UniProtKB/Swiss-Prot annotation, chain A:
InterPro entries in the record: ARM-like, ARM-type_fold, Clathrin/coatomer_adapt-like_N, Clathrin_app_Ig-like_sf, Coatomer/calthrin_app_sub_C, Coatomer_g_Cpla, Coatomer_gsu, Coatomer_gsu_app_Ig-like_dom
Family assignment from sequence similarity: Belongs to the COPG family.
Name of the protein described by the UniProt record: Coatomer subunit gamma-1
Disulfide pairings: none
Organism, scientific name: Mus musculus (Mouse)
Gene3D superfamilies in the record: Coatomer, gamma subunit, appendage domain (2.60.40.1480), Leucine-rich Repeat Variant (1.25.10.10), TATA-Binding Protein (3.30.310.10)
HEAT repeats: 44-81, 263-300, 302-335, 336-372
Keywords (A to Z) from UniProt: Cytoplasm, Cytoplasmic vesicle, ER-Golgi transport, Golgi apparatus, Membrane, Phosphoprotein, Protein transport, Repeat, Transport
GO terms under biological process: establishment of Golgi localization; intracellular protein transport; organelle transport along microtubule; vesicle-mediated transport
Gene that this sequence comes from: Copg1
Swiss-Prot record, chain B:
Subunit annotation: Oligomeric complex that consists of at least the alpha, beta, beta', gamma, delta, epsilon and zeta subunits. Interacts with CAPN8. Interacts with SCYL1 and PRKCE. Interacts with COPG1. Interacts with ARF1 (myristoylated); this interaction is required for binding of COPB1 to Golgi membranes. Interacts (via trunk domain) with ARF1 (via switch I region); the interaction is direct. Interacts with KCNK2 (via N-terminus); this interaction increases the channel-mediated whole cell currents and promotes plasma membrane expression of KCNK2. Interacts with STX17. Interacts with TMEM115.
Modified residues (N6-acetyllysine): 25
PTM comment text: Proteolytically cleaved between Ser-59 and Ser-60 by CAPN8.
UniProt lineage: Eukaryota, Metazoa, Chordata, Craniata, Vertebrata
Protein name: Coatomer subunit beta
Species this chain originates from: Mus musculus
Tissue localization of expression: Predominantly expressed in the upper one-third of the oxyntic mucosa and in most regions of the pyloric mucosa. Ubiquitously expressed including platelet, liver, heart, spleen, lung and kidney.
From Swiss-Prot, chain C:
Localization per Swiss-Prot or TrEMBL: Cytoplasm; Golgi apparatus membrane; Cytoplasmic vesicle, COPI-coated vesicle membrane
Membrane topology listed for this record: Peripheral membrane protein
Name the record gives this protein: Coatomer subunit zeta-1
Residues of the full protein shown: 10 to 148 of 177
Residue runs in coiled coils: none
GO biological processes: intra-Golgi vesicle-mediated transport; intracellular protein transport; retrograde vesicle-mediated transport, Golgi to endoplasmic reticulum
Subunit structure, as described in the record: Oligomeric complex that consists of at least the alpha, beta, beta', gamma, delta, epsilon and zeta subunits.
Domain of life of the source: Eukaryota
Length: 824, 129, 139
């Protein structure tokens, strides 16, 4: 239509004296036209045009004002000294009428940056509360843009934003709730308060419902303090308003992840909610679906089926038919697959071009995804090869072949062989590469390789370089794997085809010379089956889904080992007792992502305990350095050393340790409590993940106590015969004490309490005791730190409560004393 | 002796690289064990040659791709090879400085049989009886 | 805050009489036109309120020599999108003082540009009331 240069240029007159609202407005229209028609502005002339226009803001005409808003936003980024236009926009923005109000806030806020943010706020507060949708919605979207430049200004507007939220007017609410969710967010909980306020309400605003559904879709039970249900009384889990999109979004989330469970007037576990909307017009597309559903997509699938299946079969309209395939695909599942496959077979008949490729891929893809047997997948993959013969590709040769060598290989090659009979050189580089690669790699004894070779030999002549090169190298590997083959390799390679073309020659000269001339140490080594060049995943199935309706390694296996590894890096802990075990009951001192996350584990050594404290400073305003967790033992333990966490910045874990020595004569338990306080140096930080200030202050954060149990000292085992082990460990360290467990009225619980506390597995599966028997003998075994066995015998008497005489024997005085004390 | 410099701009440049792998794999080291140097001698080249084939190594600011061309070819033969580092002996160099089978005339053994345009017409002629 | 991906009003070839991009995914002419050609090819010569293109529900209508578009998300349905598309058709008609054809749009290029910006704002649906848009805009 227009020329960008002439129009950008003539705009410069505004900058001088002429303001002429008609002429300038036209010139502006022309700018909008240059963009719209599709053109790109030249920067010098743009920069000039922008400074000129600001003069035009003096004249207040509604059409000129309008031109001015669109033109400055489009020209804003390809212009300089734009800042002048802010004042003019504020002047316009306060002027009453929707033409100015709404369009200005949007143009102003786009140009506005954090410095300028402050200016627009009075006018913004006035514009947001409006139940006149233009002014309010433009102001609400405007605030969203402004969250970037400066967050804090926008946040103050949360009250005006909320005020708009209370409208049932669709725009004012959609914008209000949507924006609010973004704005007020400083934690989940404050947003959740905003949502609960609207939540109990039966809106007539579908957009608000939708934007909110998304916020809601996850279970929120902290909305406005707390509440006893994930409840959403606005359609998400409810079905207060029917309207097929909202109904679909809501129904797929709620069914197997309740936003609330099913109500008689609002299904929300049952499959129903989608289905009542399901017979419909074009509208049906949302309605008919599924996704998730109780307990599977399949009972759901049956409802809707008439609709999806008739459109999919009948309509050879692309627009309908696509909705019908997506809808079939959605009502699908593992079960559904029988049905889904016949339909997809049928579908290509309506739209057959790419759609053909897709259905032959889909039937294979569905068989791989939803199991109807891996074999059937191969058989479908043959049908794909047959029908298209060329829309298979290179990625198919690699994917078919890799997939095939899971089971199919002998068959696949053979099928491929037959498939190769097709068409000599229009079959493509890829099929020849597949029969060639497979015949090379398997080295057929399932069928005679001579047919395969004869088929491939012809294809090579008239097809691309990459296959002819493929054919020589394959032949060489084929030689190395099977001796028999060598005579065919020679007739093929001497030919002008499989060698002596171009690329084919170079590869061949190498491959040939290595087979012919050389040892074939290399050739032998090279064939490991004669496999592909790469093993990807199973690419086809996802591709197909969209297209149709258009080494974790480990050391440790035990808590002691993983901790032992962590400990081992540090010297002191392995140098001063080596680790018998680490706790089977590690206790987290301070909860996750609050102030600190500290998890401590107590590790036992031959004569020591090391406490590993994994410390996180989740303090947004700080970053920590030289952090240690300090300890006060409540019994006689010596605290030898502290190992610091070098730094703990915001949200970054670090580990600190305290090594203490264990008593080895203590008459009371090694079940003991340590009071923990982390001390550290704080340097100020701007929350990101870390950043330290030039100077800072000392600060401390209090932590929970760490409890060490007898369970940490002992590792559980059972014995085949307790009595022998029990005598064998040391009846010379034997001590006996009688306890009453009055809070345990039966033997079975009693055995469980001694077993858990001590960290001893009761022998011979003695946690199950004959219910309410007068006498019982409980056999305990486990190994104590240092590597010495500890056996405990508890002879239980059951009155109405449990009394036990617990006799313990151990290779030391300490386990005996420790167990006896801890139990009572 | 240029070779690190020439190869390296390309090795870190892009275009289409499937078949590139095959050809570079048998090729890069070859001929005389230490007779180049720009900031990568012939040995850096053998390193490179191996990385490009299917290995991994910092050399020529890394190769463009490593994953080979059509499924049969793979890296391995050549990887084993370069017994004597890029030197005319019984390696890549041998292969490179030799020609696969007979190569003589215009019988189509490293040949193409006259002038390419005249040949299209001759191929067309089926000579059906 | 997002519903509408883009709005296009296209001649009966898919070429840009108009498009205004409420996505940031098409700003350059080449690609804005490609998009336009893409959506017009699927959707056209099968009029319904549904089309699925690019994994997005595309809602469209037609006139004498134009097809009118809203592209939006496919987690929705036609009807939500349709309310935008109905506003788009309607508001342009009342605004221009003549029904949407290539002739009405070209007749008043300014009314068309302004009217569409009120309907969609950066992919959020700013307005959907045809009457409101028309008063809001000044020719």
């Amino acid at each position: 239509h227009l020329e960008k240069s002439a129009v950008l240029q003539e705009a410069r007159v505004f900058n001088e004296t002429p303001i002429n609202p008609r002429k300038c407005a036209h010139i502006l229209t022309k700018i909008l036209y240059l963009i719209n028609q599709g053109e790109h502005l030249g920067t010098t002339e743009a920069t000039e045009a922008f400074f000129a226009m600001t003069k035009l803001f003096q004249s207040n005409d509604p059409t000129l004002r309008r031109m001015c808003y669109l033109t400055i936003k489009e020209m804003s980024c390809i212009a300089e000294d734009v800042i002048i236009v802010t004042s003019s926009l504020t002047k316009d923005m306060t002027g009453k009428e929707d033409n100015y109000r709404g369009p200005a806030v949007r143009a102003l806020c786009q140009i506005t940056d954090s410095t300028m943010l402050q200016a627009v706020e009075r006018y913004m507060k006035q514009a947001i509360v409006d139940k006149v949708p233009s002014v309010s919605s433009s102001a609400l979207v405007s605030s969203l843009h402004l969250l970037k430049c400066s967050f804090d200004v926008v946040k103050r507007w949360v009250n005006e934003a909320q005020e708009a939220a209370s409208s049932d007017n669709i725009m004012v609410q959609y914008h209000a709730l949507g924006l609010l969710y973004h704005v007020r967010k400083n934690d989940r909980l404050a947003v959740s308060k905003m949502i609960s306020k609207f939540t109990r309400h039966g809106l007539k605003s579908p957009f608000a419902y939708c934007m909110m559904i998304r916020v809601a879709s996850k279970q929120l039970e902290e909305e406005d303090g707390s509440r006893d249900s994930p409840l959403f009384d606005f359609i998400e889990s409810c079905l207060r308003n029917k309207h097929e999109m909202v109904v679909y979004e809501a129904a797929s989330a709620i069914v197997n992840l309740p936003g609330c469970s099913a109500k008689e007037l609002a299904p929300a576990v049952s499959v129903l909610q989608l289905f009542c909307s399901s017979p419909k017009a074009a509208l049906r597309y949302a309605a008919v679906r599924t996704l998730n559903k109780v307990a599977m997509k399949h009972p759901s699938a049956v409802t809707a089926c008439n609709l999806d299946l008739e459109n999919l079969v009948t309509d050879s309209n692309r627009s309908i038919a696509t909705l019908a395939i997506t809808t079939l695909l959605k009502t699908g599942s593992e079960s559904s697959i029988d049905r889904l496959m016949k339909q997809i077979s049928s579908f290509m008949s309506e739209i057959s071009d790419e759609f053909k490729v897709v259905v032959v891929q889909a039937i294979s893809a569905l068989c791989q995804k939803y199991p109807r047997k891996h074999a059937v997948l191969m058989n479908f993959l043959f049908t794909m090869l047959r029908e298209e013969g060329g829309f298979e590709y290179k990625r198919a040769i690699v994917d078919c072949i890799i997939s095939i060598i899971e089971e199919n290989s002998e068959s696949k090659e053979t099928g491929l062989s037959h498939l190769c009979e097709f068409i000599e050189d229009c079959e493509f580089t890829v099929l020849a590469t597949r029969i060639l690669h497979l015949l090379g790699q398997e080295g057929p004894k399932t069928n005679n390789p001579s047919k395969y070779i004869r088929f491939i030999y012809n294809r090579v002549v008239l097809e691309h370089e990459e296959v002819r090169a493929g054919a020589v190298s394959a032949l060489a590997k084929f030689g190395a794997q099977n001796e028999e083959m060598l005579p065919s390799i020679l007739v093929l390679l001497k030919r002008c085809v499989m060698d002596d073309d171009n690329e084919v020659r170079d590869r061949a000269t190498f491959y040939l010379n290595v087979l012919e001339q050389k040892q074939k140490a290399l050739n032998a080594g090279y064939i490991l089956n004669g496999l592909t060049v790469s093993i990807p995943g199973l690419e086809k199935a996802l591709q197909q889904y969209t297209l149709e309706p258009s080494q974790p390694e480990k050391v440790a296996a035990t808590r002691q080992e993983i901790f032992q590894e962590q400990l081992a890096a540090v010297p002191e802990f392995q140098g001063l007792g080596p680790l018998f075990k680490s706790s089977p009951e590690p206790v987290a001192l301070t909860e996750s992502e609050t102030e600190y996350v500290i998890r401590c584990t107590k590790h036992t050594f031959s004569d020591h305990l090391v406490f590993q404290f994994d410390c996180t400073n989740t303090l947004n305003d700080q970053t920590l350095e030289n952090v240690t967790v300090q300890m006060e033992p409540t019994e006689a333990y010596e605290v030898l050393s502290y190992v610091p966490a070098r730094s703990l910045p915001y949200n970054q874990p670090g580990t600190c340790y305290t090594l203490v020595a264990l008593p080895t004569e203590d008459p009371t338990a090694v079940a003991c409590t340590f009071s923990c306080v982390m001390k550290f140096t704080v340097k100020d930080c701007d929350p990101n993940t870390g950043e330290i200030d030039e100077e800072g202050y000392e600060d401390e954060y209090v932590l929970e106590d760490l409890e060490v149990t007898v369970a940490d000292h002992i590792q559980k085992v059972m014995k085949v015969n307790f009595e022998a082990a029990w005598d064998e460990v040391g009846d010379e360290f034997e001590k006996e004490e009688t306890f009453t467990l009055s809070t345990i009225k039966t033997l079975e619980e009693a055995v469980g309490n001694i077993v858990k506390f001590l960290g001893m597995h009761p022998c011979e599966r003695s946690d199950k005791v004959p219910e309410n028997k007068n006498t019982h003998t409980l056999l305990l075994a486990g190994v104590f730190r240092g590597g010495h066995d500890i056996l405990v015998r508890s002879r239980l008497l059951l009155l109405d409560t449990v009394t036990m005489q617990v006799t313990a024997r151990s290779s030391e005085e300490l386990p005996v004393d420790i167990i006896l004390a801890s139990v009572g | 002796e240029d070779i690190q410099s020439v190869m390296t701009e390309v090795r870190r440049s892009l275009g289409e690289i499937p078949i590139v792998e095959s050809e570079i794999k048998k090729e890069a080291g070859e001929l005389k064990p230490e007779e180049e140097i720009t900031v990568g001698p012939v040995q850096k080249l053998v390193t490179e040659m191996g990385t490009y084939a299917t290995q991994s190594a910092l050399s020529s600011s890394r190769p463009t791709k490593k994953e080979e061309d059509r499924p049969p070819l793979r890296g391995f033969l050549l990887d084993g090879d370069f017994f004597v580092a890029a030197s005319l002996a019984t390696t890549l160099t041998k292969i490179a400085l030799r020609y696969v089978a007979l190569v003589q005339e215009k019988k189509k053994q490293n040949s193409f049989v006259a002038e390419a345009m005249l040949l299209m017409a001759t191929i067309l002629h089926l000579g059906k009886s | 805050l997002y519903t509408v991906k883009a709005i296009l009003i296209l001649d009966n070839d898919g070429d840009r009489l108009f498009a205004k991009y409420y996505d940031d995914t098409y700003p350059s002419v080449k690609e804005q036109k490609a998009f336009e050609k893409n959506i017009f090819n699927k959707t056209h010569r099968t009029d319904s309120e549904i089309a699925l293109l690019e994994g997005l529900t595309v809602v469209y209508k037609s006139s004498i020599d134009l097809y009118f578009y809203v592209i939006g998300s496919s987690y929705e349905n036609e009807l939500m999108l349709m309310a935008v598309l109905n506003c788009l058709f309607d508001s342009l008609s009342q605004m221009l003082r003549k029904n949407v054809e290539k002739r009405a749009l070209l007749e008043n290029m300014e009314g068309l540009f302004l009217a569409v910006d009120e309907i969609v704002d950066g992919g959020v649906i700013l307005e959907s009331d045809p009457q409101q848009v028309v008063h809001r805009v000044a020719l």
